[PDB]
Amino acid sequence: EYIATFKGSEYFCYDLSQNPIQSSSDEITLSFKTLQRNGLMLHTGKSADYVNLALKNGAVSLVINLGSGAFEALVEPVNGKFNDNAWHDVKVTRNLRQVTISVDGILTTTGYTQEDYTMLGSDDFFYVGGSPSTADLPGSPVSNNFMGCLKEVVYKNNDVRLELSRLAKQGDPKMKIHGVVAFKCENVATLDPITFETPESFISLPKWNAKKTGSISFDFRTTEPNGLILFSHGKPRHQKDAKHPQMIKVDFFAIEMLDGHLYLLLDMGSGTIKIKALQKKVNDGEWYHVDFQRDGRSGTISVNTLRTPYTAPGESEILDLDDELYLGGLPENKAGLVFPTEVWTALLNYGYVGCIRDLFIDGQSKDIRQMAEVQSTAGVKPSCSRETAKPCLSNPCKNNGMCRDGWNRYVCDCSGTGYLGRSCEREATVLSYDGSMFMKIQLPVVMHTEAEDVSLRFRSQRAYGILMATTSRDSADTLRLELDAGRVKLTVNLGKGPETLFAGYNLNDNEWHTVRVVRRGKSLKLTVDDQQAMTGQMAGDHTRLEFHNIETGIITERRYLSSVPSNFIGHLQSLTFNGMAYIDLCKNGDIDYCELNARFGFRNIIADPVTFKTKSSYVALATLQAYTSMHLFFQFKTTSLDGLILYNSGDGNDFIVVELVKGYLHYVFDLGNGANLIKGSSNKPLNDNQWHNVMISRDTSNLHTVKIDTKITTQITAGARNLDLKSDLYIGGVAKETYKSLPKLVHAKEGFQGCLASVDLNGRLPDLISDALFCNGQIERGCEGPSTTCQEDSCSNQGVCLQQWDGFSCDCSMTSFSGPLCNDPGTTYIFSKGGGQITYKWPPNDRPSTRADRLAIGFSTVQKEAVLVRVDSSSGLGDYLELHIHQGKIGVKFNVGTDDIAIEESNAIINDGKYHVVRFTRSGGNATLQVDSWPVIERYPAGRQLTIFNSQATIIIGGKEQGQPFQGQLSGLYYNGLKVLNMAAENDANIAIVGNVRLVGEV
């Protein structure tokens, strides 16, 4: 008996080149034992002459070609199945071009081979139980090797009788046993399926060593609409892209799901191909078989037997993958791993979740439930079950999150809720922007994308402002979202003009709105809150977008743009870009490439408040631009009942005016139909010293709207050709002589006094002071009077008072002290009995060489002789500076290359117990020394004086090296911009502390 177990990754090989088979007559015998539905039993021959025997989807398949057209047969499972793990006889007879196939004896099928040939000629190979490439050998309807036992295998022909089952066992130098080996039966088989429980779960695979040809098959089952199933790429290509030379190009293939649709993706050198593998959505929670066969430029993808052919552009036959192959998703931050933009699920972080079973690689079995299964893979579980209970009744999504029933898990869409996290349980961070603030995500490497999921939530009182934008340091291309005339505007510009969508109206209501953008290639989708989605198709065939940043607040990278959307005023929350919650990531420090001066947490915003100190103060700005609609916003605060706030005039009688009259806000205008007055609605005079918001707009239907704080007033006026205004735009008043001839219904005799803020002139945020064309009276930054200014008494220990734009500051450097008024103790160390030593050692390339030095330190002591601090140059240079006490008197001695220059404070008692401070300056040879309030002592040496303290290496504090230990207290040492004691207190790495010395605790 000749029975042998075929591992599935094993097969027999017989060389026929020493004695070629060619025959008019022949017969084949065997029995088979298998669980599996597909598998090659035997095949011989090349071009047009072959014989093929195999199990195809549970039926015995036989193919024979004698050179002239094959006879195909597929005998059927009559009464039961063949893959029943039981024995089944197979006889095949051939007389000339006539063929009888037999199953078990008596399941017959007879036909003929085509045209006229009769001679089966093959001088190449005879294969049993599998092959180097099964899907490849001619006539093969299977791509799989054999799994299970095969029996009593013989090809008898008129001349020779190659009994293959015997020759393999008894051993023949014509029989090659390629891989594995096994020689007995009653041996079983099966291979577990797998569930990928989480998106990020993934298995790494042996290298797909394809080439010209290759095959891959597997089954899947999921209910998830989106997920990357299989992916692999080659080495980077020198041959670059003319538009994005920073984008790495690679040969690759992927199989992905997008919205339930299965997709093949391939690129072998020249252009990608993207094939919908089946018309039907496949996330049915139903098993599917997937066969991928390729041969050079072409191949097929099969879902459940339904072939779909493809042909990739250009002439590149080889798909040259090298190294790893991925199943069910990808690693994050793996080094050397390129994400082609053609594969959308990869860049959208849609790792696959669902089941997979029965993998094959060029017809070779693959055992997932082991692979990296029994190799510590997170998210992978042995068998595969579909939990009956629908996950979304657990009701698990908090705070009105949308709940989606996933595979064995619920998924929450928290986007419009103010939360994030698996179940919308984590409160989302608010970032707050005042017209001058930005938050910029600088991606660690440059991004390129063909598809994006972007969402955010915002609130604004302004009808314009940037919401988010991508930017590239290398072009003007961008995907952005902005408020435009109260609507959200999406713009995609890839270098061929802007492609735009608009959604929503009147979104400047200071209420939170959620904006969701979905880009898929040329396809654009924008939806605001729960309104109807707006969709559009980009015109030009550019799709790839490059960006180095995601920007909010201000668009800061705009190198190639001479103008930009205006800055944002308002709050953002839940910026989510391809599933990255950048605001929250930034806040929590989960990423270190965020850079911002926006502020976290909600607050009511007062942007750039500015004070008109007198009624008569005012600025003139460039003319209001109110082409088509107009949207003015601003806030004000005043104690006056009456004043002109804004005036701009046009041709003819045209004008627009905003003014406070008797405490009430008046919008006066004439657009060609006569002067009109709309009173803003409030019960109380508005001059109660409180910020009030004013919004005035005129839309393209001529509806005017004045909103004062929370109250809307609308009025509709006559249809009119809208015309430019002409004069400068006046804010806070007009020139004194102008009031005597203001239009018709304008009460003003005097300008505004008080504060303006958040001034938005139909898209433009002027700095009222700096953008002024001219200016009258006083206009002061802030709403809090002027900055503090320097007085005699301002800083408190000879600290130096300095004027800053926002109040004075105090330089404490030369004092021994610290704090904002030089009134707190500087860092203090106590050196006690026995000596101590703090040493600052410069790093060897940061060794200073100065021609001017200055040094300050506070000290108390009772000692007659000590060295407090010494600064030494390196190794072999002589230069040094030393602050010491000699005979109870503080002094400095230094040498910068000429002679030792000494300077002593000869009269002041300093070893005394009490706190004293010493100040030393040096400029070349000249020097000064001051202690406390004593007159500055001055030294001017005459002669050749070298001037440079060369290559300063160390600062030693304590005197121990110099044989003269300090004992007492040293406080707040400053040397040439270094605060050596602070640095020591803060454990700077370049500070060594040794011996009896102690940091004092503050209060």
Ligand SMILES: *[C@@H]1O[C@H](CO)[C@@H](O[C@@H]2O[C@H](CO)[C@@H](O)[C@H](O)[C@H]2NC(C)=O)[C@H](O)[C@H]1NC(C)=O
């Ligand atoms: C050291 O001190 C001398 C003496 O004051 C400085 O030389 C004088 O500087 C003034 C104006 O800056 C010159 O106009 C005088 O002619 C100089 N007087 C003499 C006698 O030289 C000198 O510049 C100082 N050196 C350093 C390195 O600061």
